[PDB]
Amino acid sequence: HDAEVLDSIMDRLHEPLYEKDTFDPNEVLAENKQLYEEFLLQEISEPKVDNLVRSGDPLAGKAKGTILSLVRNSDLEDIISSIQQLEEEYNKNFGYPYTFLNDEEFTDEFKDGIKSILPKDRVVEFGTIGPDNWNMPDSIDRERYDQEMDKMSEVESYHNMCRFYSKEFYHHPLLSKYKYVWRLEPNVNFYCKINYDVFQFMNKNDKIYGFVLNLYDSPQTIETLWTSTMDFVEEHPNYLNVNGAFAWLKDNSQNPKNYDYTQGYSTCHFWTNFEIVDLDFLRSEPYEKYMQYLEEKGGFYYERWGDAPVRSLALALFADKSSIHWFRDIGYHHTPYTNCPTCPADSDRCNGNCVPGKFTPWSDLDNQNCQATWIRHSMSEEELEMY
Ligand SMILES: [Ca+2]
Ligand SMILES: [Ca+2]
Ligand SMILES: [Ca+2]
């Protein structure tokens, strides 16, 4: 980068978005609820773009994409619930395959249970994760881990999962053939019909990532993630994209404590239990190098670094934010949050099982919402008018 542009990014990354003590977080919270509400109460239906691929168009079903679920055998019924909703609101008209991964061996009953609730011609693949692509690596000092996890109270397997979903899933052999994943978790809800091919929408409009919910994280899980990340970026300034979502990373105005705790990160992240992702990005040098650097720091184990903030940092820093799409139209819930859009009055696109704009039923969690920051600072001119 031109030194001036780069310098100006570095400056922004080293200072809070709003000067300390020039704002009251409670007023910021209210303003932000209001901004969120304006978007959520707007009547929308689908992206206002040219190229949407309908069900049965020649391009429908032709993206190299899969729906991906990381599961244990005991998740069978919960993942079935999610699958049925996904099929009902979207995939019954497009027929993308499912890929299931598990750190243990899948049982035949899991597999048959899955197959029994999908159409006969729906393609499903089940893959085990090699122990060496899951387990705590040798580079981690286990007693140091045990010590840190003693204080922090945890399941080792949760740490493995976070790491796996940060840096390994996209290397799984079953995924080598795909460019796109729609990540699906157990026990979620979808509320609204999607009548265009989501992957083709991504490809045709150059979106590398899609999300529905955007949240604050727990700062104690990621104590040195941001500081380490800052040092990484200073060693690889060429990985920065000039239109990174830098303000979103630096917004200290709603939860200034989260910012102080991390010494510079809002903790805002895409809530990755839902994600649509272009794997070219995760396979690209900046993302792979960042993952190797976090692997070397050990924070996946010495701290509790979630795949969400990790993914989000990399997306914010190494890509143009205008390529990150907020799927406002995908009504979605995973406890305790819901993205529930508003339809025109005559529309049956949404099934009526979510209350439009009701982010969570527990108003104490309202300040975990980071969507307003995303709207205010990260949405490109195109994204702002896209619905
Ligand atoms: Ca400067
Ligand atoms: Ca620095
Ligand atoms: Ca430094």
Residue numbers in the entry: 71 to 223, 231 to 464
What did the study's authors say about this model?
Ktr4p is a member of the Kre2/Mnt1 family of glycosyltransferases. Ktr4p, with its large central β-sheet, belongs to the GT-A fold class of glycosyltransferases. We used GDP-mannose as the sugar donor, and tested mannose, α-1,2-mannobiose and methyl-α-mannoside as potential acceptors; in the case of both donor and acceptor this was based on suggestions from sequence identity. Our results, shown in Fig 4, confirm that Ktr4p is an active mannosyltransferase enzyme.
X-ray diffraction data for the apo structure was collected to 2.2 Å resolution and indexed in the space group P212121 with the unit cell dimensions a = 60.2 Å, b = 102.4 Å, c = 156.9 Å, α = β = γ = 90°. The Matthews' coefficient suggested the presence of two molecules per asymmetric unit (corresponding to a solvent content of 51%). In our structure, although the extreme N-terminus is not visible, part of the stalk domain, corresponding to helices α1 and α2, is clearly defined in the electron density. The complex structure shows that only slight changes occur in the Ktr4p structure upon ligand binding; the monomer structures of Ktr4p in the presence and absence of GDP and Mn2+ can be superimposed with a maximum RMSD of 0.37 Å over 386 Cα atoms (chain B of the apo structure superimposed on chain A of the complex structure).
